[PDB]
Structures are given as structure tokens and as C-alpha cells.
Amino acid sequence: SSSSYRDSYFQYRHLPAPHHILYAEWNQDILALPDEVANIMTSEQNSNRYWNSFHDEDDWNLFNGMELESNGVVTFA
Amino acid sequence: KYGPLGITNFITPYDLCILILIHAHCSQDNGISVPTAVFLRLISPTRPSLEWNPLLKDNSNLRSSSIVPPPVLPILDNIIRILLDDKDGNKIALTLMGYLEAINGLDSINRLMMDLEKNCLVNNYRSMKMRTTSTRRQMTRASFLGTFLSTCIRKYQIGDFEMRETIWINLQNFKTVFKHTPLWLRFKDNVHIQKVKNCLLANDEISVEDQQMVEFFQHFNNGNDADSKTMNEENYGTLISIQHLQSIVNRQIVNWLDYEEQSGLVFDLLDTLSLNDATKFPLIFILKYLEAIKENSYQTALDSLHNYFDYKSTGNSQNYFHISLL
Amino acid sequence: KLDEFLMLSEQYKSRLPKIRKLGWNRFKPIGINKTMYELEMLRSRARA
Amino acid sequence: MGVMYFKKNEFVKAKKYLKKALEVVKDLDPSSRTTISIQLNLGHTYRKLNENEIAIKCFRCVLEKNDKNSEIHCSLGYLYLKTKKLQKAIDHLHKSLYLKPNNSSATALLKNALELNVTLSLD
Amino acid sequence: MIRRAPTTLQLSHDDVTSLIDDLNEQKLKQQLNI
Amino acid sequence: QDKIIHDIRIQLRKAATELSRWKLYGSSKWAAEALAGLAPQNGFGLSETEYDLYLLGSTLFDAKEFDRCVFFLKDVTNPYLKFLKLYSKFLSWDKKSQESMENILTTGKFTESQSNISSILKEINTFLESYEIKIDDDEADLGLALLYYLRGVILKQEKNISKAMSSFLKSLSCYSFNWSCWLELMDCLQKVDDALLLNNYLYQNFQFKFSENLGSQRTIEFNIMIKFFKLKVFEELNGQLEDYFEDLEFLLQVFPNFTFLKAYNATISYNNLDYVTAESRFDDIVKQDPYRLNDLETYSNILYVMQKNSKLAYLAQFVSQIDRFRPETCCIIANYYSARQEHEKSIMYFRRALTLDKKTTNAWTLMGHEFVELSNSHAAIECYRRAVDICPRDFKAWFGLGQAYALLDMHLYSLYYFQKACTLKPWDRRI
Amino acid sequence: DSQDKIIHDIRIQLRKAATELSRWKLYGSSKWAAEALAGLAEAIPQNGFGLSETEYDLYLLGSTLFDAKEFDRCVFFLKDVTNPYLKFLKLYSKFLSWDKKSQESMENILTTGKFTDQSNISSILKEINTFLESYEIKIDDDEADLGLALLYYLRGVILKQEKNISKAMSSFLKSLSCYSFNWSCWLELMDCLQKVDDALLLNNYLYQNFQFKFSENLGSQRTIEFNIMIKFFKLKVFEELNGQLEDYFEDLEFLLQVFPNFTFLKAYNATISYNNLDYVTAESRFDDIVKQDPYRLNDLETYSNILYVMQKNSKLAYLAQFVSQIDRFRPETCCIIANYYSARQEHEKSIMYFRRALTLDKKTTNAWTLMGHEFVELSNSHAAIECYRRAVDICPRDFKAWFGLGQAYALLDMHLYSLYYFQKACTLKPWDRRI
Lengths: 77, 326, 48, 123, 34, 431, 435
What we know:
part of a larger assembly, 7 chains, B: mainly alpha, two-stranded parallel sheet, globular, E: mainly alpha, 2 helices, 0% strand
């Protein structure tokens, strides 16, 4: 027949060690994403605080109990 | 008989030799019953687990009430010398010799193993009495040989084709070592070998065409040395299980502490570990330690002791840190 | 001391049916919206 | 605008405005949910208008632009079942079901194509 | 400023059911002629 | 013969070196191996400031560091060095391009997607459109054919078969004596009547670029491998053969002791179910080239029918001794376990072989058969599907689906599946 | 003036250097050669081989069957050849066939070596000696081709794997003398070195009684003072072993001028700052590498090592996502991610990646100590102790391994049972306050 003669796709000789096929599962590993999954509702709060750290004192004081309504009218605490 | 040593969790070539012997005994076609003392010297070292604390306990259970022969090294030269002693042991010895000649292929190995599980080994005694139509002796699982053969059966179905090839490449290496030995010259021709070999070689189903090229597969792989050999990874000269190594080491240290043994062969073989089996077998370190004290070497004693107590503590779940200091 | 041979013996014993027990559950052919896990449960009720 | 005028079942001003939109955007937006969206919408309007020929052509060009899409395959199969080209539609239904698990409407369509294949006795 | 996906509609259930009913019609009438 | 064979040697020597030079392992392997069976011309369009990148790109590719090579050739205006970057870029995507459902079977782990190639396809169109000399006339050279060939294969990825043939035939007109290009052309057929139509295109519409090629090679019928083309097509699917026997004889006279021809020639017997002759025709090639491993699985398959397990086992022992991770090596081993009725374990080795190429010969189908003996009836059916999409020309793949659906209560889906396979192999009495 | 003339000389040679080595299908030096030319400062193809057209056909068969991983098949067809150029290929195919096979045979065995610290291998060695005697130059001649020089390299490396040290260097010096500009040749000569005093032993030999074959090498290059890998020699060995530096400075800035764009040099230069516990400066050095060369899984293990000390888990999560996207089979990419997982206190996952990283390349002993640390935070002291223990079996002169093992006992009430381990570590780095 004719199997190894075609070179139109990733074959056994393109990767360096042909014996790497033994593992062949590390590709199917979802590496954990940066920030919130380190907490594993608390993750978003932790992430919120982590980004919330970047304020000036008065600026943070403005947004302590900040709430914005849909129509655009503003409530300040 | 020397060579590199490596621990194997698979069927060692030594293991098949017992399987060779048990096949002849159970077949009862040749009327050859291997003496019980032979089995008890061969299988018993393979029986698992003895344990031996470094110090703080001396031969509290290791000493056998009856003096036992030393365990046998996995070389055809040593194995044959056990059967050879008897006046009729030649007949038993040739039985082993012929079977090793008949087994020329991996398939033939499988024929032996399929034969035993289907016919010889049987789950329990209650089916002994219903199987009076069997022309071969049948084995119970709980028996001395039965429990061993069960383990051997397990170690064959446990691996892929990768392990089976290693069995045959090593056995042919193992068989050929005995070939360039003076004793093999003494047994160059024995006519009985051909008789026993032809007993099992029969029913080959082909003798004219395949056998012409069956030899070609065998010979081409083998080191005919006519051309450059096919290049293959370095293979170990001897394969032993962990439990078999436990028996030979324990006997050696006990013999050292206070039927002939082969100190040189055991010591030389123990010096070729891949350093990973040493982790799997921490007792190799202390074997140097007992040797170290004999010549009164201070630092060489110490590191070995520290070596032994680092691998042992991790392997065993119970806390032995309180034992290391003592 | 964990015997390495017994450990790998159980590991082989666990994986061997795993190939056989593959087609269970999630896998569904097309044209049959109902996986084979309940093909035998209905088959069990058929005779029983 | 075209999607709306399709909703109101006008089927005419929708087509005109959609054609105007694509003729505006012939040069740019080769991909990225713009050309595919407008072209598939125009093809669906042509299907609703029973003009199936340029419908087949535009659905084919959309499919060759992007293959992984259950809707494109299901609609092309619907177009083929409108005519008598079952041999070239049941494969598309096969692929559509392969891509997306349920496709209940596609399941019914393929089943009907099955009874057709039983019914027909072509050499 | 970001754009969302433009509205696109696929084959509904009513039209495909109309086609299935019709297609049963012409898989049903012709064997009477046969 | 006379100078005809001599003219082949010089030009075939070319097809061995430049193909190897610009990292086409598969094509160069066939061509160079043809030198041995057959009984330093150097040249490339490069500048000193640009020749350096080719060395940089080639050796990074050799070290299998695919992805770095793409960055280091980010801006190259060379007509055909650009091919090397895109080739690296394509493969970098491919290795991670595993469909989810097939992957579950591919591994059993049981746990940006495709837009890269769309950019790749747009890049190649943009480059050629802006390139100085198009494919028309006696212009273009060897490197241009590679671009179209790379363009052709990527077109096949989105199942654009109709345009795929145009690109491939275009590429080969510019440069011939590339084996790998014709291999992908085979998968473009998936039908019987088109083959003669394609044959008609070659005989009348097709023309060669004599500028690059040597004498007596622009003509189609003096070409030697257009026979190879005809050999491969009439063995994948018989159909109606045209000059098949007559042309086969001529190519046998040339290329003495050529292993590939003998394997193909012997393979014909297997397609004809003449097992006794097939073994003899396989047996000699083993003696001649013991270290050749291609298409030994066919030798295993026939031995499976004959059930010469003793013979088969030594074959399995012999094959595994010299290599243990080539796709045929695992394939033959998995076949061996089937002979031992150990169907549950043959899956594992077939699984190992599958991950090696993931587009092999009919190994997907053999994987499915073992599931049938396990009565899974659901892994096997979707398994049989994977053979279909890859190679829709496989008789066994289609047959397995109909056979499996026969066991299923519904028989309605089975009729269509059998109908396709009926067209593929109408000669079979069973179907 | 003279420097520019040197630059023009360097370009010609590295073009030749990467040509034959890649043409002879060895990538240890071929990959080095091009990148070295790539980083060269801005200021017709060259090829030649004494092969007959009949035998040259065999070359193509041998060459393409090599990289198709069918090494054994290459040997069979190339058996009867007599040319020294192709003779090297046949044995090299035989050698690599063994090397690949040995890797296949052993994957579950983690540690490598022999406790006390062939016949198949000896078959290759005899063929080398048999062919070398038959051939009618046998080195020590002005008319010595590259193929013979390359042939000695195979002889040197095959001898060392048999542990026949003190003979391999002699072969390697002969190979380097007849043909310099073989980076793969220099490494295998690096690994054989063990101590700084031997570095001085050989360094002199390269100076007084060493000279290159000026016939093979181009002019203005055979001079030892204006050579390059003699300079590249100084940079690598004196610092990887951390030996006493001599003739080291003036060579260093000399290489910066000639190779301003060389990625390998900068990472090594960055490595030097890392090795001196100078982390701020090194971070700046590596940051150029990432921007200039985004795809280099060669020295970024140190980068992630730095970033772990740095903190900024956010920056570390940048690398782990980016590095893993390239490929998951390099030794480094499996240690890059392990650090990121460790920083987030998932040890039971991060512990696994470290073992994965070691499995790919067993020479990266640095992962062993990191392996043990994650055990400690899992409160499994037993599992930890053997871990550090393997690290010091592979090489006794490991300060980190001894210290990590001493601590694990120290966490337990075995204050004295730990005195030995700490005492051993004292010899390695006496000049530390922490110990």
C-alpha cells in the first residue's frame, strides 16, 4: 500500500521522539486560568477585591456603596 | 553466568524453568515425577515477603528450624546442577533440557501457559472428583504449587506485547549462556533430548514451506554474525523478581553473620543495579553496611546506614523514624 | 510496604473492562437518540 | 432591516435591502459573522421565495467559506429535499447531526428522507 | 464599542413540519397509481 | 529503455534532493528509494541575505521546533521560502487539531479552533495574487508547485474537494516527480466515474511544463509515474481498467528489485483473495528487505485469515524487535491479539497505532471489528464512522455500519449504508 | 578594519558549518550553527563532496531514510559502502537506532546510572577501528577531510557512553583539530569534564600543543586567539562548573561585539546575572529575549524560576498559559507550569507536573529538589525524604538536595538525625550565613 509516503499531516516522524505517543494525554489538559480559580461566589468577590485594590482613598470612598441604575439616575452613599 | 542484573515484575526466565518442571510432572505421560525436595528448593524462595529489620532484632523469625539448601541463582548452569546429581536425574535433567530446546518461539511459550490454565490449574477440589476423565494431574489453587502458578499466570496476563518480547529475547540470551559452558559440551548429544523434543514439537501443521522461512525469522534476529547484527537496546543478562532477591540476600547476610553458596556470583550481580531497583529494594544498601563493618570503615558504614533508613521510612507507612536513631 | 506488583495488578484489572465499558453512557449514535445503557435496561424488563 | 422585513413576511423589501447591504460590503468583511450572516439570510429568503437555484449556489458558497455549522447543513438538506436529490442531502443531514447533537428538526427531516429511500427503487 | 452577532434565522419547526406532511403526501399517493 | 532509463536517473536524482531540501520527508523517501531499485546538480533562487534564513528555518524544523520557525520568517518575500514558514505554521496547528468525539476514542481519557488555516488559506491566495509571475505560460518553477500543493492540501481540509483537484493538478503541471502530491490526489476521488473523467482530463486537457522537466518527460505517455498514478487508482477501486495490464508490464521491466512495486503487485493478489499466491509474493520481499516495514500489516491480515498463528507470532516477534513505535508495528501486534481471541486488548494496541498517524490504512475498521465481539455495538458503530469521513472509499467501513445496524432493531438506516458500499464493490457476492 | 575582515570570514565559515552538518543529518551542531549566523552582526550557494554518481544515489536513499526514523533500514542498504563520508552515516544510523531503542525500552525507570558508580555497543566501536586502519590517511595529515574528522566524533561519543573516559577527549580533540565549528562535538567534551582543575588541565592543552588543520579551515581562522568556540569554550565551561575565571572577561565583550543579536549569548549573559543572585538585572536581560524571541523553550526554565521568587502570580499566569500553548513535551514547559500551580497552593497537582517534567529529560536533576518541596507542604514527610535522596544519588555535589533533605528531618523532632545532612551541606557552600 502507501501510508508513510504522504506527508500532508502531522505524522509520527514530525514530533522528535516517536515514543512520546505513550503519554499522548498532556494535550488534553485544561490548564487553570490565572486569577479566581485559585480560590477553589467567593472567587468573584476575591477577584473583585483584587482589582478593587487599585483606587485612591477618596476615589475608593466614592465607590464604597456605589450603585448605578438602568435609566442612568445615580445613587451615592 | 555473570551479567547485568535488573528487577523485573514479569515472568523471569528462571520462572519458566519451574513452569517447565511442573508441566512434565503434571502431564504424567512420561511417568516422570520430580522429587518433592526439588520443588521446595525452587518455588519456596519465590514465595513472597520475609522482612528483616537492620538491627535491634536478630533472627527472631528468620531462622528455619530445619536447615534449608541455599536459594538458587537464575542460571541454567546452577539449575541443572540440582537435577544432575541423581543417578536418574539425567532423565529429569534432560526433560528440562529438551523442553527448553522445544520452546523456540514466543508462541510456543504461550502454548505452555494456555495449556496449564485451561487443563492443569483448577479453581477448587470439589471439581477434582468430577474430573476423573483427565489424562493429566490437576492442580488446586490453594496448594503450594497452585498458589505459585496462579501468580505466574497473573504475571503473564498483566503486560502488553512489550513484556512478552522481553521474555523471549532474554531467555534466548539466557539459554545461549549455558551453551558456551563445559557442562553443555558434556551434554552435546543425549538422544533422549530429541525424543522428548519431538514429543511436543509434533502437530506443527507445516514442515515444507513455513519452516523454511520460520527459521529465517529466528536466525535473522539472532546474532548470526555473518553481517552486522540488528541493533537493539542493551538487554540484561539475568532477571529476578523482588521476592527472589529477598531470599538470596537474607540467606547471604545470615550466612555471613555466622550445599554450597556462590558468594562471588551474588555479590557481582548485586553490584549492577540500575540504582532504581535499589530504591525498590532498599536492603541492598545494608548489605554493604554489614560488609563495611567487617573491615571497620567508618564513613562507608555511615552513609550506607543513612542510605538504608531514607528509602525504608518512605516506603513503609508506619513511622519508623523512632527506629532509625536506635 | 506497598508491593509494586500487586499495585500494578489492580491497575491492569481496573483498565481492562474500561475499554469494554466504553460505549456506556454519554456516547449516542445518530438516528438513535437513546444511548445503549438503557438498551439493556429495557431489555432486562422485556423478559422480566 | 432585511431580517425585519423577512419577519413581516414581505419577502421582497427584505431581499432588496439585504442585497443592497451585501453589495455595499462586497470588498470588506470577508468573514467574522458578517458576510456569512448576510449571505445565509439572503439564501433563506430565496428559499422562502421558492427560488431554490441561486439558493443552492449561495448556500454552497457559504458552506465552503465555513464548514463547521449545523444550520448551513440542515438548510442545504432542506433545499435538496425540496427537489429530488436525496442522495446528495442525506449526507449533509448526516454531517449536521454529527456536528450538533440534537437537531430535532433535522432528525425529523432525515427520518423522512429515510422513508423516501425505502419508497424509491432507483437502480 | 462592540457589535454583537447580527440577527439570523434558520429553518423553523412549522415549515419543516409542513414539508414533512407534504412529503408524506407524495410518498403516499404514487403507490396507489402503482 | 536506452537513454530513457538514463534520463530518469538524472531527473529522479533531482526529485530526491530538493524535496528533501525543503522538508518533504514523504515524497523524498519514495524518490530516493527509487534510485536503489532503478538499474550533484545544484541550484536555487536565493540571495546571501536570504540564504541564511533558509538554513535558519530548515534546521529549526529539523530540531522539530516548528513554532519558532514561523516567527523567524515573519516577513519573507522569497517566492518559495514562504512555503516553509506556512508549512511549519500549518503543522503547528494540526497537532492540536483533534476533534473532540474522535479524541475520546483516540485516547479513552474520556474528558482559534479552526480559524488559523482560514488565515493561512487567505495568506497563500494573497501571496500568489501579488506574486510577480503566475502559473500561466512557461513561467514559475519548482517552488511555485509546492505553494499550490500546500494550497491544495489545505483546501481538502475544509472538504473543498472540487477546488482541491484544480490546485493539485495545477501544481503538478508546473512540477512533476513529486510522489506526495499524488497521494493526496487519491483522496479527492471518492467515486468511480470521475476517475475516467479525470483520466480524460489528463489525456487531453492536461499539459506539462517542459521548461522545468527534462526530455521525453513533458509527454504524458513517455512519463514513467503516470503509470504509477494509473497503478494506484485501479487498485484502490477496480472499476473498468484501461491499459492497466499493458502499462504494468513496462514499469516492471524498469525499476528492478523495487520493493514498492512488489508490495503493490502482491497486494493485488489480496484484493483478488488469492491468499496462497499472496504469501509467496510477500515472502520474497521480506527476504530482500527485512528492515522494510511499510505495508507489512497486509501480510499480517492474510496470515490472520489463514490463522497460521505460529507463523504470525514469529512475524510479530520479528517486527517488534527492530522497531516498537511505528504504526504498522502496533497494527500487526493488535492483529495478533485478535488471533488469540483477546479482543479486549487488541483495542489498546490499535489505539496506540492510531495516534501515530490518525490517517492510516484501514486500521480504524479493524478497531471496530474487535468492539463487535465485545458486543459494545456503540463504540464500534461510531468507530466505523471515523473511517468513513477520513476515507469514504473503504468498503469495510461502510459494510460495518450496515452490518452493525442489522443487529439493531431498526434496519432502515442500514439500507443506505449498504447502498454506498454496493457501488464501491458491486463484485462482492455477500453484499 | 581587522574586525570587519573577521566578520566577513565568519559568515563564509558558518555558511559552510551549517551546510555539511545539516547535510550529514546531525542537528546537535546544525541547529547551533544557523542561530549563530543569525545573530551575527550586520556588515551563490557553497557545496562540495567527493562522491561518485553511482554511490551518490545511495546517499539520497540513506539520507531520507534517516529522518524518516527508519534507521535500521538505512543500515541494511548502506552496508557495503566504503566511502568514509557514507561510512559515518551507516554507523551513526546504527548508533541512533540504539539510542532511540534504549529510550523506548526505559521510560518507567526515572533515575539513570549504575549502582557501583556494551557488547552491542562494542560492535559499532570495532567497525570504527577497522575502517579507520584500512583508510589511508588516519588523521595527523594536512589532507584530512571533514568526513574523517566527523568520524572521530562518533568514535569519541560512543566511547564515553561505555565510560571509557580519558580516551574520548583524545578523539574529540582530534576531531576538533581537523574540523572546528562542531558545537555538538563541544558539549560531549563538556559533559566529560568533572572538576575545575581538569578544566585548567585541558585549557592549557588547547593553547600550547593544539593547532587546527589550516588546510580544511579557512584563512584567518585557524589562529587560536581569533577563533570562536575557543572563546565560546571559555564562556560555557568556566561558568557552568562555576570555576575560576581566566581569559574570561576580554573574550566576553569580544563576543558581544561580534554577536549582538545572538539569542543564545544573551540568555547565557542573563543566566550569569541569575547565577550571581542578581535578579533585578537578569529580569531585564530575559525580557529582551521574550520580546525578541517569543518561542524559545531552552532557557526559560530560569525565567519562571525567577518569576516564582518574584511573586506576581498574575505575571506567572501569563507565562504558564503562553508557554503551554507552544507544546507540552519540552522539559521546561512542564516545569514552567509546575511553578505557577505551586504558587497557587495546589501542590497535589503541581507535584505531578514536576514528575512529568523530569520524565521527558532525566538530566534535569533540579526538578528533584522541587519535587520534594511540594511534598513538605502536603505534610507527607516520608514521601519527601526519598525525594531529596534521589537527587543526591544522581550527583553527590548538590547543595540544594542536601539542604532540602536536612530540613525535612528538621521539621520533625529529629534535630540530631538531621545534623549529618546539614553538616554535609556545609562543605558545599561554607560561605553562607543561612546554613
